[model samples]
Target chain A: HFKTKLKNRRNEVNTCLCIGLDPDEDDIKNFMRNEEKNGYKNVKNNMNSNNNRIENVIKIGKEILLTDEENIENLSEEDKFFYFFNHFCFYIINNTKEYALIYKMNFAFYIPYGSVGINALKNVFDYLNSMNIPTMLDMKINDIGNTVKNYRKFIFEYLKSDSCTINVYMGTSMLKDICFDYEKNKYYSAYVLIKTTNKDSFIFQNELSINDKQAYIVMAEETQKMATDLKIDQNNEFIGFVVGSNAFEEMKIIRNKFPDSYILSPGIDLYKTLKNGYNKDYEKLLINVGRAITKSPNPKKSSESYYNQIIQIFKDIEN
Target chain B: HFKTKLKNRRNEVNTCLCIGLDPDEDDIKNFMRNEEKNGYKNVKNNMNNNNRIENVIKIGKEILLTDEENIENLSEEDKFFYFFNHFCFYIINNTKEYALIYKMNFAFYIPYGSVGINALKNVFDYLNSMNIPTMLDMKINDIGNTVKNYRKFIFEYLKSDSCTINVYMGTSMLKDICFDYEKNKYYSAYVLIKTTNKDSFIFQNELSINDKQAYIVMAEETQKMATDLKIDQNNEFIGFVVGSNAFEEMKIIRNKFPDSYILSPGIDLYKTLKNGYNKDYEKLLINVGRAITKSPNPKKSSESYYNQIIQIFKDIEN
Candidate 1:
């Protein structure tokens, strides 16, 4: 399954750096200007341009800066935006793949452009999957059981991402239906939000207490119970926790409660988080860096910096 | 502006029936079967089939179910799914004038993939152009840029008038994202207060703040934020989504959010109209889904619902 592939990739790479491939309108415009200023030197080879949608999008990747306004004036607003967004993703992924173990594509960034944006996103996922790279479609979808089924289908079945991020706001039952399929012998994996990374997350996840336990603590316990019950043949990686690295104390508590499950932590400083977030098991940590790397002028160099820093931390921890 | 359109619609229709346009796989299949068996007689006179997406959607729906080879060749991600854009347009066009507003659950369109999203966008375009207010039942709860993008997607791209939001991330984030800082305007949002789902109470009813349930705490905190934002009752941008199953909780919530609108789904129109609506039938909106959309004739079903609600209003007013 996708989980096994990601775990194997983690060990092989010796890096826990999961790059967040979140592209914004501004990012696309900046990438376009940078590429155009460089005189289109990156268009090295002309791959076979075919009629297939995925091939068409990949072909557009080669001719990224080639399409001027006059070339795309006939396209709709969605199509025009897709050309830039798709090329921006392909460019970033091709440059930074060596340093990253996994890539997380946040769903929100592409959704505003509608289907054309989604089509572009699908093309990127195809490119990554063909390269045997695991991806997390970071949706943070939280809904009732029935509604979750559709979201689950869209994420795992249709989009075919390795995993996704979910919110446990509707509680454990929402996870019950989507966790495992005994007949199909398949498990749908996700990183459940325990303590989120947002500034105002404390208002609910921390402040609101249930039976003297903070809401996030309750979420941890509830998640552990669900994950435990859903485990088959001693496989417990079907569910993970999304605890922001900033909350190290809470992370320690969550770690104590659910020790075996993976933790996907997203924060700014990789050094502080890697040092504090991982107490013993470094392999279980998937530290996500979004703006710190993707927004940098040199994404390849930024990824290399973060990747090397992570290796140093692991070595120091071992010594 | 969306709120004004909804209020005006309520006054003109003389009914507070906000039909939920949530069509499932079976609903679409059944619609196709019904349309085909009628000898394709319902292939009404062609409205203009211009190149505009909205016009194309309307024209296709008017034609009603053809083009088998075209659907077969489309890619899995972008397949039209028996021409869903047409199906959605048909439902909306049929029920357009009767409903006070239309609420679409985002989940229903998700499983069909990107083409499903295309249908949703086209439907939103058709609805907004017709001057009808739309509420997207996304129940989005993410924080930061994710929430901001969702806000932009729903309000600007889809041209949705209002949407449902989850307050689990906190009232502060909700206020920040729900209100457009640049525009200095508040977007109409309904907090998921009390839901009818079986497992809703597992968290919403269990978690407490100041000796009140989580949903109540959410409602109170959100109301404070709304008041702090200086939102006028006339516009009443902040609303509450209270399920009809929790009659007692709904009553208490209604009292708390007297000025704000209550969008209650899974409603029995007659029973809710008699009790759920504030004295003047001013605040509460009754949302019916499969009963209307999956009916043999969506337009007729909508008219029947609107007529019954109008009768109840007449009796209550007297």
Candidate 2:
């Protein structure tokens, strides 16, 4: 019944609009009255005394304050109150009927603070999961068989995640150990890293060809076949392909082939330069617009503009 | 006050017997009254219903049960139980009266279960810290700088241990990160695989050498130099030298040269070896006797016999 509700919600939204919840340390610091240091700790301590010990540590070390709020001492205590307020704003916008879902958090942003970072990430996930919002964690974890098994025990067993973004480069042996007979509550989204948003992505991913085609093409073809072979029920289990928005032709090819597959596109922002200009058709697929939406002067307004642009693209799709 | 009390107790006992708390999973299965393949899940579900979120998953998968009588189904629960039992055992035995302090719990035994492994090891040290009972963790951690940093965090900050056992060969970068200046709580007791108790010692440790001397001697010299250079206080830190019980002449020379240093002699059974070999002199130093005490049918009897042997050894020393 819950799965049916989520499916209907996804169709009603038409946007496949999963909000990327990468709470930058700077954004967190800005919300907590722009304290240059220990912004996360100060904010968490102020909000709830029972904040997980690990979360307090990450907040103390990593968080950088916004430009306007950089003068922390000048700001009032109420100004420090904006940390929760900013998160609430993001939550409200993402939870609206228009957005399909919200990707709760990323590991890279949280892992630096040790256990404190882990606890803070947990708290955020708990809140989002409680709201019946479908969430995904961008933890591109890959390790040896035993370590990978332990990682599974930690993330799936300890964190109680709905889905995790995994790096598939570790080969089938390790991947099978993680994804073999995994439970229904948990899902694995393999990252092929075919055409990354990062500039240096092509250096490795696009270098050689197996049969007169780019190496990434061979990788994509193999990965798609692997996913299909894994008996990942197309409708229910598979979350689909990850394509960088910067690579238009590559993304277009992916979208063309895996039409039903949910496309997770990163590197989508107002100021983001398309090294190769955007494809009008590829923009219609499932897109993730992160920094531009979250780091804007007015986040809600910025997000609404992005949503309108997406709606325009989808409208064109109907024609 | 606690330190003084512990000191007095140790003086009375004349033995530094650190009881190992290795709770096998098979014991937990018997305790929980469940025939399930995964006894961890069975015990957790039966004990705490609220914890049974999904029928397939168990909340407390990391804990081990030592005996059927005491069903310790969580890491926190097991740690407190073992600590309290060990503390009582120490108090009754006057363990502080002994020459060296106690060594308890290894992380390899706990890391499989939960992150609570860190908390368990930390709490054991916290309980014994005020007593000034020098705690040693038997975890044979070997890794690079980042991992070694984790070890430093666990030993120096969290557990505040006196010394930890480390494998020497893996990464040489360990020497740099393992020592802390502020607390002075870290020591790397290198594991020398071959000693007299086990016949295989000569082949592994004795076979490898540089220039002329045995490989074990080279390792000891390197460790001694590392200790002298890195250590702020020489008397406070010690190097662990391992060799055969019959190799008393070599042992005496290493002991005489590194007089202030402590030597850990492994395979020290109360009874003589199969070859009837024994080192009555080296009993003044630290002796690690496991199976003699732990493997007996009655643990209490084994512990008493072990304590009696230690008392006799101390009397001979005096």
Candidate 3:
């Protein structure tokens, strides 16, 4: 269901760009500073000026944009940070909705604020669903099957995201168990971390060996086995791989070995990755750009530029 | 600091038991059923009770005795079969005299959304105030900034004394987190060296570097990190998570790093006690979850464990 939904969205947008909404403390502060410079009303002024206004915002289905303002004057630090984070993400989604096919929220960025942050995430997921936009939760979760079931419930049933990324350390059978939803008779899309983009990932991910093939390759092979064992259709990719675009040889190997699987690649160069990782028809690839788009001076223009560049490359590849 | 607190608690309690508070839906429902059988007033009947009683309980003036009129006003939708917070507090208070520490597996809490997390926070707060060392078993593994954020959330936000981490991302991230602990000296963590699951051999043992298995690599990496950081034996800031099934490997690891603390699950009074204790017995912490928490009488069950631990120590001392 996730794959089919994502495919329809990619077709609708005619682009493979997944704008990441992983705003840290710095990004929220920058957005507030920019709002100040642009003569827009700030959080404090807007706080006292909203009773019917916030009810109106909630009715419009952007509950993430408003917090409980019972007493904004004596607000706790958690509430203040939540206010900034909620508005900041709403701003990005509003501007970049046209060019982005999907959005990925890194789970760690939101969790440091504790329950308040988790509540903020719940609101945002609802907001995204109301907008009919697909979303991915980059949690990188790995655990035993019983534990993984709890995570699956939270990720799919509670938050209801389109897909999520997971680590492959728990091995293949556990992978099969988590990726397929037995109750629904539908598969949940998951991006298994085959080869990560981090430089230090080589310390373990690439070092050990299972048989002759390396560890990353073993993860890919197991993911492929899981997809096959589930008897998933060619179009409906139940399990995918998260290979770094910068790991060129391994990236190409994964693409060739498991062509039916989706590849969500995150790295430095978007264009070079696009050229290397996409299928012949420019499908089955989700090029995730986080800081490049989210932290840009003009995010709308930056997204538009990336969208156009992606289109140009598609045409160039055709030629 | 977690090690020191745990060591002191172990000395005070004279046992190495760490009660795990990982209650599933079955456990909660069973607790409620038991309360009903014991003639305790149920949630629905107490709906119109006064609020002052709850305030007294909130200030720690009252235990969450099964007869209490708390949890009165929760809507039908809000009332789960049992309150996780209340059940956890009951277990903690029942077992505190015997338990050297308590470990909460984060998976059991995250599914209930904000309510589940709030329960977890409440339990952690109560434990910290009671001066009991707590381990948040998250098994978190990620790269630098993300891992840093997780540490902040797990240690600072949640106020857990220590946590369990995965070693898949390798020692760079571990070193990064350890540096923070080394400087602050407030928090500590345990790396997953060997697990107690049936399928643990899939990656943890099957994958090898040279002649060494992945678990061995993890142990060496933990040792190497300790050596590089100049962390001595007594003031250990990092530790290993070895399962009770692998006694031979556990013994070997203990021989090598004798002073290092090891947290092992799948332990009971008989088999694990014979094979699990170190020379000091203070270094090996045995975590018992269902045997203690899910019993017919938790307080009596824990007291039995406490007595057995004392007798077993004397027998082994000879």
Candidate 4:
């Protein structure tokens, strides 16, 4: 049922496009100047005057201006919601008959500065949810029980994320608690630490096990079985797996086992081709391409290019 | 030479007090409110109007207000600086009168949000330098070369801290790079994993023949040899050896090897009875304690109690 939603959404939109807004800080500085001219400051200055009000207003104005200036400045608190909304609106307006099914935002790049980072993440999620876009907070949160509960509060309550990428280091008990907390609405996407795109992944992931399975395979099997057993609506509930673009062979093996489960294939770049070319077999999975899309010379054009690529892959899958 | 400067400064002040400022968001909320009440808002607002004359007046008012506020806020950004400057001013004002010498601040407590943490650390060091006090940034910075450069900048350029706590995980090359970077003015305070207060420290710190020596002995030997070869003064360079208060044997070993070196006894508390009980041999060493004084029911009274305990220790040493 989960695969059906993704497949239906992809068909409706005629594309599987995820617009990532990982703006550089320099981008904010440029956009803030434009906002200053456009009277964003005037609007903010007139708003409520709490202790953090003036600073918040100034920050909001700065972010609006920054967005116009360049796409590089790390998205400001105000700009993040605006940017996502604008991106979503563009998809909705241009496509008219189509819309993106899923939105994913990585929390790692955002959560360096404590509460402010957390707040920005929350705002982005709220915006996505309001637009009825199924959102994923790409936080590889791996911790013990009590800490995991706190993270649940952070992700589900504070950020109000629909789906989250969790690190599978903590055993099934941790997964059970996370699932139990957001039983009705949320989905938990576990990153079994299999075949990461990073070069050093092999150092740990490729170690041999007593059962003749690679460490990554062992972890993946554990996560997959757990998800199948616990997932409330096995069809409707989205139980996904991560397959790094770099690890083709392992990904193929994973695809064999979890045929219906959505796979997040990272390490997709447009300008720079992967060492091994893309495998057409794993095209059915939910592909996640970040830096390539976000850092493209022309983001909108790049998005279209990626959409075409996905469409071609899907056509091959249908055939 | 650096070791002597540290020792002499310690002797001159008669105290080894490192301040820590760990400011929570709640503290910032209170501080912003106080600033607003003292015409700080009007001062900032008038400046925004581009009226030079009024802006100057407001700026002057802001300067005056800031000084008063700094005293109230302790002129430090948050608790981190407040605690840091408290020790800095405390060391400067009380060291000569008392028996305290060294000042250390834990780097871990200061949450890295913006450059504000760096700024606070810089100001703390500046205050200490102005008062001619020996300062150490108790940051256990252990990272790859790229990340280590961030620490390098913090220790060498920004704060110009005399010494720093380094995690001895990366190979000798990393240590060499750090030592070379801070070669002249800075000293690397090595953390041999064995002496960590935690349970797993023994496995991590204890070194075999092929492996680097355990962090503690390796640190002691390194400080001794480095001081002898590179140090011009007798106590110019020293070691911050971590020994349990009750572990007299370990203390004896540390004290014997680095005779003139300064030692920091971690987990020392100011209760009526020391956690590890009193150690007469630890009279010369600087004891670093945190939670006891911090979490005390009445912090000021606890501080006074600590001062008295130190006085009694000094008396015993005499």
Top TM-score model: 1
Q: What's model 4's TM-score? A: 0.47
Q: Model 2 segments beyond 4 Å from truth?
A: A1-6, A34-100, A182-192, A269-284, B1-318
Q: Over the stretch B155-207, how does candidate 4's per-residue lDDT look in tens digits? A: 54434335444323223322432354444443434333223233323222322
Angstrom error of the Cα, residue B167, model 3: value is 2.0
TM-score of each: 0.89, 0.46, 0.88, 0.47
Error of 2 at A289 (Å): 2.3
Mind giving the per-residue lDDT tens digits that candidate 2 earns over A70-118? 4545655434433343443334344332444445355545433334445
Between candidates 1 and 2, which one is better according to lDDT?
Answer: 1
Q: What's the candidate order when arranged by decreasing DockQ? A: 1, 3, 4, 2
lDDT score for residue A169 of model 1 = 72
Question: Cα miss at B297, model 2 (Å)?
Answer: 18
Of the two candidates 1 and 4, the one with more favorable DockQ, higher being better, is 1
lDDT values, one for every candidate: 0.73, 0.44, 0.73, 0.44
Instruction: Give TM-scores of chain A for all candidates.
Output: 0.87, 0.71, 0.87, 0.71
The root-mean-square deviation over C-alpha atoms between each candidate and the true structure, in angstroms, is 4.0, 14.9, 4.6, 11.9
For model 1, residues A1-319, the per-residue Cα lDDT tens digits are 7557876887677688889998988998886576567653332211222123244444323343345545655656656566667767777777788888899999888788777667777777877876788788988887778777878778777777878888777668777656665555667778888887777778777778877988888877777778777773265346888988788777878777766768899875556666656745454678888888879888889999988888887788777
Q: How accurate is candidate 1 locally (lDDT)?
A: 0.73
Alpha carbon deviation, residue A240, candidate 3 (Å): 1.2
Worst 10 residues of 4 chain A by lDDT: A88-97
Task: Give the better candidate number (1 or 2) by DockQ.
Answer: 1
Model 1 ranges off by over 4 Å: A43-80, A181-185, A232-237, A269-272, A279-283, B45-82, B233-236, B268-275, B280-282, B307-318
Question: What is the C-alpha DockQ of each candidate?
Answer: 0.67, 0.02, 0.59, 0.05
For model 3, residues A31-135, the per-residue Cα lDDT tens digits are 767665665444433434433333343322244345444443355665656767776776777778889888989988888876777776776677677767888
After TM-score superposition, the amount by which residue B201's alpha carbon in candidate 1 deviates from its true location, in angstroms, is: 1.0
